Amino acid sequence: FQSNAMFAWWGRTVYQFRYIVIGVMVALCLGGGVYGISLGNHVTQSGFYDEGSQSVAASLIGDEVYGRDRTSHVVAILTPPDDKKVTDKAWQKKVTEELDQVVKDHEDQIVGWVGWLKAPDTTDPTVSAMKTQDLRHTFISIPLQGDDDDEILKNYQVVEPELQQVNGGDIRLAGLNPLASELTGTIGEDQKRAEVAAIPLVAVVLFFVFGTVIAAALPAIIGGLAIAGALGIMRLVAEFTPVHFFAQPVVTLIGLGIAIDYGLFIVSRFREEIAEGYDTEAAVRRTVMTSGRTVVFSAVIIVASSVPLLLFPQGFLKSITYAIIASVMLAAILSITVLAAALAILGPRVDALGVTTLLFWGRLVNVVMKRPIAFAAPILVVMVLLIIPLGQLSLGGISEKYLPPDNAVRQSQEQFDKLFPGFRTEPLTLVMKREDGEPITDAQIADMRAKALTVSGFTDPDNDPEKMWKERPANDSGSKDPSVRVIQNGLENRNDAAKKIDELRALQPPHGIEVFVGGTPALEQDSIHSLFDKLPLMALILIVTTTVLMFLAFGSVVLPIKAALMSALTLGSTMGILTWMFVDGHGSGLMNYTPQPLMAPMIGLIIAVIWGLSTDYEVFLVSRMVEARERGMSTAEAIRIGTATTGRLITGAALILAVVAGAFVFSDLVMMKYLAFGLLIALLLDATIIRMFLVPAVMKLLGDDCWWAPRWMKRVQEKEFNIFEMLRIDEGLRLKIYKDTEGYYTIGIGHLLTKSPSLNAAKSELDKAIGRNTNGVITKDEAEKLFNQDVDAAVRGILRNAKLKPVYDSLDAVRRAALINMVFQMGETGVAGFTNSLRMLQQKRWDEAAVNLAKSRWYNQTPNRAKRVITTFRTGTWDAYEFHLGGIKAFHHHHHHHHH
Ligand SMILES: CCCCCCCCCCCCO[C@@H]1O[C@H](CO)[C@@H](O[C@H]2O[C@H](CO)[C@@H](O)[C@H](O)[C@H]2O)[C@H](O)[C@H]1O
Ligand SMILES: CCCCCCCCCCCCO[C@@H]1O[C@H](CO)[C@@H](O[C@H]2O[C@H](CO)[C@@H](O)[C@H](O)[C@H]2O)[C@H](O)[C@H]1O
Ligand SMILES: CCCCCCCCCCCCO[C@@H]1O[C@H](CO)[C@@H](O[C@H]2O[C@H](CO)[C@@H](O)[C@H](O)[C@H]2O)[C@H](O)[C@H]1O
Ligand SMILES: CCCCCCCCCCCCO[C@@H]1O[C@H](CO)[C@@H](O[C@H]2O[C@H](CO)[C@@H](O)[C@H](O)[C@H]2O)[C@H](O)[C@H]1O
Ligand SMILES: CCCCCCCCCCCCO[C@@H]1O[C@H](CO)[C@@H](O[C@H]2O[C@H](CO)[C@@H](O)[C@H](O)[C@H]2O)[C@H](O)[C@H]1O
Ligand SMILES: CCCCCCCCCCCCO[C@@H]1O[C@H](CO)[C@@H](O[C@H]2O[C@H](CO)[C@@H](O)[C@H](O)[C@H]2O)[C@H](O)[C@H]1O
Ligand SMILES: CC(C)=CCC/C(C)=C/CNCCN[C@H]1[C@@H]2C[C@H]3C[C@@H](C2)C[C@@H]1C3
Ligand SMILES: NC(=O)CN(CC(=O)O)CC(=O)O
Ligand SMILES: NC(=O)CN(CC(=O)O)CC(=O)O
């Protein structure tokens, strides 16, 4: 619990079942990936509104009674080839027959085609308006089949290829479905751009991190298994709840980079351990206990940064939140299962194949350390003046402007609105529902119209307020229930939406009738309102949880307050820049996008994403500084320690992430660029300004005060392993007299009492040793003290031996215990026989000594104990004893049994 206890268990478990683990998980990830390629046909485009808003309710009631509008499904501009005019009866007949053929061949997809071209001899002003007055252009409407927008789009995409060939191909398709097909079509382009531009780029970066093919390929394989598995999970999620189109690229944009970053960290750690002298099995466990632990905790931070998005009612954000959680969790799991097992099978062979086969930063901190205010105050001000273009943001819905200005589908729509003005409308609606269920009378309608005319700001083309707020059209999909009537009118200024909606909702409905104010402006504004109405609580929950987790990771009261400061800074600065780029349009001409109002759900998402990004990177950096301090370093040093060995990893992690996000800034979908850029900025801001400058400078405000909590701080007693626990394993611990392998009476930790066959003689010796009537039984304490005096005796003899005193003096405390261990087992004169091996140890040639000692007869008679001691010589840690193989069936009394 709250301890490496379980990571230690899994670290050794994953090695032991390295074949089973690596087989099952790859099977599941590949199996899921195969199952996850059908996700593309089970995704939705809906989820940008508030399902519980009055505007959505108005739409449901409206569509129920009057029928959903299908006149906007497909709009098609027809233009006669040889500067001919639409009045040409011959041209009229060929095109008409072409249109009838498409409808005849696709009646499951198409309702029919409607337009002036169907009745050129009409007196209808609107129908006659479906042709330009130069008679060079005319448009038709092509209503499609389907009971929801996803089904309708699929029906469009079915008939689109043949529909595009009408009029010799000179037919321009616009409206909802051609635009929706183009907007959702951006997904595949971004995926393919990642698969071709981002993947080899990541491969190169990885190959410049490790000098080896295998070591560089492993993180890439993990990312690929993560994407496959995550998409399979999202496909499973689709069986229960709607999954948005935008969830698929998020898996690749965010999941892939994070997964590879995880793999990079763990493989890198595994190599450290190998180089430190630990064998494969131990290296695997130590990697999981440290890096695996860091990865899992990283996943928790990101999940905790994503969950608050579920407070938002937009299905768009919910799907994405599910996608992030599924990606990050799977990434963390894979890095400590498949990857660990792979390293457990490969071992040092992760560096077997190198480049041949397919072919004082450290004082810079000090500068700012000495000069904290020389760097902090300017940056602290600069990143605030970057927040000032965050006070100038606009919010809108989805339009053709989300596509680049040179996009053919966008331009077709823009030509339609140019050639045929007035046809495209976004009116506010007054949806009236009578509660009794009885018909709504003309008196009640005239009542509502009057109260609507009270509100100003609505269009009036016919210059007569009697012809304002006309009744919504009805089709054959409508129930025509008399208890529901809908009147509607458009705004003169669309930026008056939020205000005019309230005024309409301020009116008083007549005769007990529920009035629902709807329309696309209402849907957008209600969604905008819903998101900022809940943003504070989401922000509170976000900040609190991330701070609470940092209370646990740091053990400080100030540092989490400090990091919150930093994230809120790098957030507001980043979002201020994004607003400067996408709202004000700085960079628009260069990156070929249109300056426009943002989308409110993308703000909630980018807040969570930037926050979790800032928190995760600072936790890893700071947590280590903390470890150095506990290790005994100085405030200024602990910081130096921290920054320097997180350095190469953080930059290597930020870079790979930047590559992936960099592939997505080229997306034709403008909100995708907004997201990908938000990544790059906050990433760059943390990999440099925050980490290398602000943090250390804003860590010097004080020496020893940032580390402070009451006695509600980590105990970290550390059960500092000692020589007592060491030989307790090798020689046993018995509190009652027993016979060892030679049949001699022994007690405690291998302490010979006597060679007499008499038990009472041994009890005699024990009573004189402990200083009381023991009756053959001692306490653990008495055994420990007894053991100590034996250790002192062994040391005195070692220091008395001229063959052992030099090597003993040269050794660290841990390796000294290993030498004492040998003296206990075979005696000083025995240990002094290893003249060459002792010389190697004295020269700190750990590997050579370890190799040489294994060739001994001592290793032959007692391999398990010898390997334990030898490993201790190789690494200089207690690792060989803190985790050892069970058994130890034979106990034997040691040399240097001290007597009173
Ligand atoms: C772990 C890493 C890799 C992840 C890989 C994930 C594998 C995905 C699961 C394997 C395939 C599951 O198969 C799928 O399961 C669900 C069970 O609820 C079934 O779905 C069933 O339950 C839902 C519950 O409302 C019903 O709406 C549905 O009509 C019904 O058929 C699917 O018909 C089946 O096709
Ligand atoms: C992502 C952004 C999406 C952008 C969406 C842009 C789509 C624009 C859709 C334009 C809709 C044009 O739809 C067109 O409207 C007129 C009415 O106004 C219809 O005309 C219909 O109503 C008129 C009178 O109101 C009747 O006299 C006529 O008999 C009838 O056909 C046309 O049959 C239809 O083709
Ligand atoms: C990256 C993949 C993620 C998927 C991206 C989303 C693509 C699908 C949504 C594109 C269109 C947005 O959703 C759509 O917006 C337009 C206006 O905003 C609405 O269209 C409304 O306004 C237009 C004029 O502007 C009217 O002609 C039309 O009668 C009316 O319905 C649609 O009712 C709504 O369905
Ligand atoms: C060890 C294996 C390593 C690789 C494993 C990863 C497998 C998954 C990678 C590809 C993601 C799934 O496959 C993906 O599915 C959808 C539908 O099938 C495709 O995309 C399709 O629908 C999307 C939106 O729904 C459209 O934008 C696109 O025009 C269309 O082609 C993607 O272009 C394809 O990339
Ligand atoms: C601390 C633990 C961290 C790990 C948490 C893992 C995440 C799992 C939490 C799922 C929350 C429950 O998910 C529940 O179903 C859907 C999912 O969109 C939500 O969606 C709700 O509104 C949508 C509109 O889009 C409806 O289609 C849906 O019928 C409705 O349930 C609910 O508001 C939510 O209550
Ligand atoms: C992690 C920290 C998180 C930060 C905490 C965030 C709390 C900030 C709450 C501010 C509330 C802003 O409130 C919101 O402002 C914008 C304008 O700016 C309004 O938006 C309205 O005005 C703008 C400009 O005229 C229009 O483009 C937009 O279509 C319209 O809806 C919203 O209707 C309103 O709800
Ligand atoms: C998607 C939402 C809600 C937030 C963004 C999620 C993102 C990118 C966090 C940044 N952190 C991911 C990789 N971080 C890397 C990992 C390896 C190593 C040690 C840890 C873990 C810290 C660094 C260096
Ligand atoms: N482990 C040892 O020192 C064995 N030595 C024995 C010695 O140094 O006297 C022989 C050797 O190094 O080959
Ligand atoms: N492990 C035992 O029971 C006996 N041991 C001997 C010992 O621990 O001293 C054999 C060995 O370690 O190879």
Q: HEC string of 196-228? A: HHHHHHHHHHHHHHCCEHHHHHHHHHHHHHHHH
With a CB cutoff of 8 Å and minimum separation 6, the contacts of 444 are 432, 434, 510, 511, 513
Integer Cα distance of 551 and 566 in angstroms: 16
Integer Cα distance of 568 and 586 in angstroms: 24
Integer Cα distance of 376 and 697 in angstroms: 6
Task: Give Cα 852 to chain centroid, integer Å.
Answer: 48
Residue 753, H or E segment = strand 751-754
Residue 549, H or E segment = helix 520-554
- Distance in Å, CA 398 to ligand 3 centroid: 6
Bridge partners (DSSP) listed for residue 516: 431
Q: Is 780 in the pocket of ligand 3 (CB under 6 A)?
A: no
Q: Is 860 in the pocket of ligand 9 (CB under 6 A)?
A: no
Integer Cα distance of 848 and 865 in angstroms: 19
Ligand 5 site-directed mutation target among 43, 310, 325, 546, most atoms within 8 Å of CB: 310
Sign of CA pseudo-dihedral 415, 417, 423, 428: positive
CA separation, residue 651 to residues 252, 440, 687, 688 (Å): 20, 68, 6, 9
662: nearest Cα among 257, 317, 279, 300: 257
Q: Which ligand 1 atom lies nearest to the CA of residue 28?
A: 3
Integer Cα distance of 165 and 287 in angstroms: 61
Of all ligands present, the nearest one to the C-alpha of 224 is: 4
Integer Cα distance of 893 and 886 in angstroms: 20
Q: Which ligand 8 atom lies nearest to the CA of residue 835?
A: 8
Q: Tell me, what amino acid is at 766? A: L
Q: What is the largest CA-CA distance in the chain?
A: 129
Q: Tell me, what amino acid is at 841? A: L
Integer Cα distance of 780 and 725 in angstroms: 12
Q: Tell me, what amino acid is at 193? A: R
Q: Which residues are annotated as a binding site?
A: 45-49, 616
Q: 3-class secondary structure for 134-196? A: CCCCEEEECCECCCCHHHHHHHHHHHHHHHCCHHHHCEEEECHHHHHHHHHCHHHHHHHHHHH
With a CB cutoff of 8 Å and minimum separation 6, the contacts of 740 are 746, 750, 752, 891, 892, 893
Query: Residues 663, 699: contact at Cβ < 8 Å?
Result: no
Integer Cα distance of 384 and 372 in angstroms: 18
With a CB cutoff of 8 Å and minimum separation 6, the contacts of 349 are 214
Residue 428, H or E segment = strand 428-434
Residue 888, burial from CB neighbour count under 10 angstroms (0-12, 13-18, 19+): middle
Q: Is 233 in the pocket of ligand 1 (CB under 6 A)?
A: yes
Q: State the Cα torsion 334-339-344-345 to the nearest 10°.
A: 110
DSSP 624-670: HHHHHHHTT--HHHHHHHHHHHHHHHHHHHHHHHHHHHHHHTT-SSH
Residue 15, burial from CB neighbour count under 10 angstroms (0-12, 13-18, 19+): buried
Q: Which ligand 3 atom lies nearest to the CA of residue 249?
A: 1
Residue 602, H or E segment = helix 600-630
- Tokens standing for 173? 């398709």
- Tokens standing for 542? 């976000």
Query: Residues 138, 86: contact at Cβ < 8 Å?
Result: yes
Query: Residues 285, 336: contact at Cβ < 8 Å?
Result: no
Residue whose CA lies nearest to ligand 3 atom number 12: 398
DSSP 84-134: --TT-HHHHHHHHHHHHHHHHH-TTTB---EEGGG-SS---HHHHTTB-TT
Integer Cα distance of 808 and 786 in angstroms: 23
Q: Is 228 in the pocket of ligand 4 (CB under 6 A)?
A: yes
Ligand 2 site-directed mutation target among 127, 172, 401, 425, most atoms within 8 Å of CB: 127
Q: Which ligand 5 atom lies nearest to the CA of residue 322?
A: 7
Ligand 7 site-directed mutation target among 617, 624, 650, 651, most atoms within 8 Å of CB: 617
Residue whose CA lies nearest to ligand 8 atom number 9: 835
- Tokens standing for 472? 């919504």
Where are any strands of DSSP class E within 229-326?
243-244
Integer Cα distance of 24 and 225 in angstroms: 12
Q: Which residues are annotated as a binding site for SQ109?
A: 616
CA separation, residue 389 to residues 113, 478, 547, 588 (Å): 48, 47, 27, 16
**Strand-strand pairing, 43-44 and 243-244:** parallel
Experimental approach was X-ray
Give 3-state DSSP helix, strand, coil % of the chain, rounded to 5: 65, 5, 30
CA separation, residue 430 to residues 57, 62, 509 (Å): 11, 9, 10
- Distance in Å, CA 287 to ligand 5 centroid: 36
Residues serving a catalytic function are: 731, 740
Bridge partners (DSSP) listed for residue 395: 598
Q: Is 35 in the pocket of ligand 1 (CB under 6 A)?
A: yes
Query: Residues 42, 241: contact at Cβ < 8 Å?
Result: no
Query: Residues 519, 470: contact at Cβ < 8 Å?
Result: no
Integer Cα distance of 524 and 543 in angstroms: 28
CA separation, residue 82 to residues 79, 120, 734 (Å): 9, 20, 107
